[PDB]
TrEMBL record, chains A, B, C, D, E, F:
Keyword DNA repair: no
Membrane-traversing stretches: none
Ranges for domain SRP54-type proteins GTP-binding: 278-291
Top-level taxonomic group: Archaea
Record-listed GDP 1 binding positions: G120, S121, G122, K123, T124, T125, K258, D260, G285
Keyword Membrane in annotation: yes
Binding-site list for GTP: 117-124, 199-203, 257-260
Main enzyme class: hydrolase
Organism listed in the record: Pyrococcus furiosus (strain ATCC 43587 / DSM 3638 / JCM 8422 / Vc1)
Name of the featured protein: Signal recognition particle receptor FtsY
GO molecular function: GTP binding; GTPase activity; metal ion binding; signal recognition particle binding
Gene: ftsY
Length: 305, 305, 305, 305, 305, 305
């Protein structure tokens, strides 16, 4: 339940190599892994795995399995499957990890966090849930409603924020996004508020280019942290989405929403490696505590079942 | 908390009439109500109230207040406010009510329900929640995944449906929507399943007009019930959305999502009167039981505080 | 200078018939006019003349010229050219004429005028100029800024209106258009203002269909007069534009802008006949008094030079 | 090779009924055909067969098979397969047939033919090929280039037409389509030309609605025959395309292009029944003689293999 | 009347600092200006002032006011208001000024001027008005109609140009823009004409990218001067518009239209600083002489009232 | 028949220079060629010739004709016309030529060829025709159907490929393009197939940028050869189309389709010079052998007649 397509293709690679070892102590032949890896590349490409992740996986798996001897009679599966597990693990932990709580505590207040992402990414609810998480840890929070052309989205943010006791700074419909965020930062300075979260637009407006707007807000607010948020069910999209954003304003961390429904998993496996930024939180449900700090070992076990 | 703009404008009308009675047993003069009602019309139009609802409100309020005597010394507010309450109540209960459970029990199985609405309406999660509600009442359910160009939306539906034990009938990406629904109906016939719910597209596709597609599915599946679903936060939209749908395929019932965040309320007040269909359920939160059967008196008290 | 293409094609028809009379008292033969009229139809169609106007012209010209004798030696040109002049004149004066000033004087105040047209039609400046014209005639005027998504257009209207002493009623960006117009009508009632002019949107908005919006405003404001405004330089467009509008809300009168630059003239010749509404004013320049009451004889002489 | 999906689903229905007869002189039971027909409906809907054709097929097949006795030992397949063949045949020959050559011979010249269809339908090459076919039969032809915003398409038409000795009437880029066609008709009158073919636009232009333009051309040219052309490979499209066109201007005949590559066949099977117009020619290749007069028996044998 | 929002926010900053000096010879404290400047930044951002202009203003105002002593009893307002005036003045006069008349006189003829800007900028009428201005100064002028897909715009240009005696070089609808401009330059060489003005497209065409087209015309015509034209009422737009253009072809000078109606003023204040090009002319009305050479002191007094 | 506009403008330049020599052994004066070349530049720009080709032509023609003496009485035309012929010839043969057959023979199999181009370019039929050409030369071929969102285009490719005995590798609708191509390369390795041809998308998809997709496929498949295909009738387009593609992935060779209908010829003359890649094949008809290897001398004679 989760990552089925990715898991099934990884298992099919283990079984192919195991066949070669059966027909065949014996040694695992490079020619045999090369062939099976060619089939795996086809499968992973169709499962939304980025090429550079496919290439890194080939490199790691080859280096781990070529030269290896299967003591005749033992359990092949686990030797081969152990190389694959290690390869996958290594591509997850490439990005330098970030301890949000320690970064905030040690920083001069307010710690300001800018969110980027396209509409449908789950950005607005993520911000409310993160505000709640921060408060449960003893931090005060204020939210800047800089998504100024979506009255509906702001109403929804306002309703979630009232419930958990965090203030939303907003101006009138169509206001300048950067002015709203700068306003929230001043308000936070005056009240000794620990963290400012910036809710941004997720689509261009008439003569207001999305990437240009993100650069302006970044220049105006000088964020401590830029977080990309992406919808895991949009497999064929999130990685290219994060590439565009990263190109306008460097991404520090990633949050993936609706991960519990992600039956594929190639994009989720790839994004951290490609963007070179750690996954900080995963959304795994519709309740507030359904935003969990990312746990590598939990992720790995969901991939391998 | 909810319907603030609507409530504030209704209260401002009560206060204006009360002023007239104070400056002024005295009698409440038609000229005085007419004037205050002109100001109310301006206010309700800016709060997304449909004109025909504004007109019905004027007619009812006028008929209830003109000729009425305020015993000098008593409480004016409650006499005037009582007319307004009755007027609003009468526009809510214009549509003939539908008892879903009794309609299903008495019908030949399967009872088939077609949903219509644009993307963003909350249609997909509503269907899962309604399936859950039906099961809690002893009905078996199957879902037809006829929204065949949204792989992400279907994954999400599949995940919710597995959790509550209802089967999803789906075909491959881009399949014919009507064929999927007809497939689910046959499957339901074979297994003695009580209810079939049809999850439809919410946007046009290249050479596949949304309204034309809805007519085809209706003709193919002959639904017992057609339910429009609409997002309450899209005040300026839901009523015109339902008008278009009603025009292609007659709407029997309405479900409004995200009502807990609706700080305005004019559209929600209007939609049943305009479409001449009862509101069956309201979405008031992110949990499954956050889809509640519509309760008129609860609604009225949320409007008047 | 003006209407050159139309004039040149009409003259070319006169010359062709005159040739036939020369080669040939003699009589003007129906076969000869029929042939020359076939060539004229080709020419007028390429000059934006609507088919039903082409057909009416053929019918009138044929009836006027067939059977007619040219006294051999006289001036042919003027006999033939006189039929054409009469035909053109008759298609201009098909619509029942409207005396705006007498309609206003005799009406119960305020007299309300709704304008319709697509952006680029010159609608906004036309309204200011008409307000000025009305004031020069002793009428008080107020303008409703119901084009609520164009901040730039409203600024421009505000600036023109301040200069001539007329008040503009406006709400905030994105407000409900009908509420603004109803507001201006109440304001006019309170101040004894003679005329209300309604400045409307000229393009659809996200989930706000232009024709649907025009019907709502009409229902809310119950205008005495609906005026279509169109840009004469958009030859291939204005007639179809007016057809669409007429279909949603009946057009009473037409104003054509930028007529002084119209080197073609087929559309301007056609529009009144097709819509069955008189041209009330023509825009012939950039100054305020460059909006002139339509004068049939002036128009005819501009066509024939 | 051709119509594989349609054929495979029809065969699968025959085999299901045959199973029922085997497990089971015996008689073919209505309950058995009903069930198998429910599965066929699912299959035909997914193969682009229109519902009303699915319904007519059910009606005919049921009437032909219910009550029928299979003499025990004989060949079931052919009895059942014979009913299906007859049903399919009857839906092909519903429209009254048109003998183009006899219609032209008996008509007053020029016989004018207007073509309608969206770009990509193969309309432009079809017109050239039909012109060639007409000439091989002794008719003179002229082509009106009324697709006036596609310089590339007209160049291609001009090149094909020069090769077969037919004249193309064209004006300058962006000219009025109706004026071009009326021009070609006059030219044809003057030269005693038998047939005029009108090449029309296949997409809307800025302020020039496609259906409105088609009505204008029809009114101006008064065609003897209106031919819809459609691309068979656009299965999910051609029927709705023809519906729209038929709605603006009644369709007399249909030509389907690229039929040799049509591996599906549901739309091609349906279109004549739905539009109530005969298929006149099929395009089965890239050479000029690859436009063949439609032959019902050839079509049937391609469907059944 | 003009620049009200900008003026009101600048005045509100003066009053805040003056309060601090009152509550408080005294000295003006940096902490006090810093605070008030933070509020000013919020206000100027919402008034369309570009960030780099906000930053330059902060830098200049701080440097001018910090350390300054208010002789107790004197007029504070004027000391503070004088710093602000100087700051604003310095951001206006950052770009090196251009004397158009002297540049033309001293140049080898023809002096060629290319205009860039999006449709709605007022580009076409600006060119006619500038041609008139040049002629009033003794220069001969020719206009290249390189906006070849807007027949309406060219008609309007032709009409204005005939009135003032300047020739328009134009080709047929849809012609190559660069060929038209090169044609006008040759024509000017042959007739000893002093100045060529190039009227360009203001929107992309099917497969004709606007910026790519501007580079081609620049390469073909080698202009002496490139002028950006922008509509002042499009506050949220002109600066980004000029950035894009500047990026494809370097801008030498700016003309702002409809400045008399500009009730905001932040964009108009910013554009010269951001683009590093002087404002050459302002449009302040609908008559020909309503295009005025830019006058810094007039501008400043309109800002401060 | 072909290249008429280009030829006519080149001839008009020869005649102008010849006039100068007549009015005038005499010598051909640089001033005379300069003038006539200015007129030629206007003409070639309007015929879709790229500026850098216009510039190279001027440079070559000037160098060849200036200083040249016409022996008085001889044939001027041929001396001048000979310079022009040489100039045109030199711009055609600027790109280093490619012998496809020798490149394939000498390469390690499979030789992989990636095609790029926008829809409507004739890419899909070109690939089938090239496959046929390769087979007639003794090479085995496989086609990768990487244009995965066009079911119709793939059906057509499948039908052409079956006829000539080449296999098409395809996956399901909407599959990952790069995975399909990598699949075809593995299949080719296993069967000893000489050449792999990659059929790519020609338009962007929702969140799948065309140029980004082309880079991915190139990275995944490491093609030996990248071929741009372009439609000659799209004069105003192909050169900019090839520029964009070249920018994402370097173009090695060009194929121009529908050249037999190209009545203009400026773009076809320019493209090789601008892209710095040879034309490998021209499409001159609808049959398979209507894809001809490019022949410079044949091309030149078609240009000059």
């Amino acid at each position: 339940s989760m990552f089925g397509k990715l898991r099934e293709k990884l298992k099919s690679f283990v079984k192919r190599v195991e066949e070669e070892v059966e027909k065949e102590t014996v040694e695992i032949k490079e020619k045999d892994v090369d062939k099976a890896l060619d089939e795996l590349e086809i499968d992973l490409l169709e499962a939304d795995v980025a090429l550079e992740v496919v290439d890194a996986l080939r490199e790691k798996i080859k280096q781990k399995l070529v030269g290896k001897k299967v003591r005749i009679g033992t359990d092949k599966g686990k030797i081969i499957e152990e190389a694959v597990k290690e390869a996958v693990s290594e591509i997850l932990e490439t990005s330098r990890r970030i301890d949000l709580i320690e970064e905030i505590r040690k920083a001069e207040k307010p710690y300001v966090i800018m969110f980027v992402g396209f509409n449908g990414s789950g950005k607005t609810t993520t911000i409310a849930k993160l505000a709640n998480w921060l408060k449960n840890h003893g931090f005060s929070v204020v939210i800047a409603a800089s998504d100024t052309f979506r009255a509906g989205a702001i109403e929804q943010l306002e309703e979630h924020a009232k419930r958990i006791g965090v203030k939303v700074i907003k101006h009138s419909y169509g206001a300048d996004p950067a002015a709203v965020a700068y306003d929230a930062i001043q308000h936070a300075k005056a009240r000794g508020i620990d963290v400012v979260l910036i809710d941004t637009a997720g689509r261009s407006e008439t003569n207001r280019n999305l990437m240009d707007e993100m650069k302006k807000i970044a220049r105006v607010t000088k964020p401590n942290l830029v977080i990309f948020v992406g919808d895991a069910l949009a497999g064929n999209a999130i990685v290219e989405q994060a590439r565009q954003f990263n190109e306008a304003v460097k991404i520090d961390g990633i949050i993936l929403t609706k991960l519990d429904a992600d039956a594929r998993g190639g994009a989720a496996l790839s994004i951290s490696y490609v963007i070179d930024a750690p996954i900080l939180f995963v959304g795994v449900g519709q309740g507030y505590d359904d935003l969990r700090p990312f746990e590598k070992e939990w992720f790995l076990e969901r991939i391998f079942g």
